Design a binder for this molecule. Structure first.
Ligand SMILES: NCCCCCC(=O)O
Length: 80
């Protein structure tokens, strides 16, 4: 939805990257094994396949992708 700062606290439901590719579920290990996930990062709200900023990357909320050749990509939430 709307994001503030780096979207650290973003809890919106975008599920596709800025490029229109659908995100992979954090709880999943295919096509990509996540290094960030609910088991390991309990407080980051890594729900489903939603865009999240677990590492606070300055480019914003991102997600693992369903493209075996694109491990992760940033999504476009609008600035609150
Ligand atoms: N800064 C976003 C990308 C982090 C890489 C993702 C990972 O391999 O856990």
């Amino acid at each position: 939805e709307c994001k503030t700062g780096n979207g650290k606290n973003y809890r919106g439901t975008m599920s596709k990257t800025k490029n229109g590719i659908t995100c992979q579920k954090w709880s999943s290990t295919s096509p990509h094994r996540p290094r960030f996930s609910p088991a390991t990062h309990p407080s980051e709200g890594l729900e489903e396949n939603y865009c999240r900023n677990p590492d606070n990357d300055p480019q914003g909320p991102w997600c693992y992708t369903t493209d075996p050749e694109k491990r992760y990509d940033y999504c476009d939430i609008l600035e609150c």
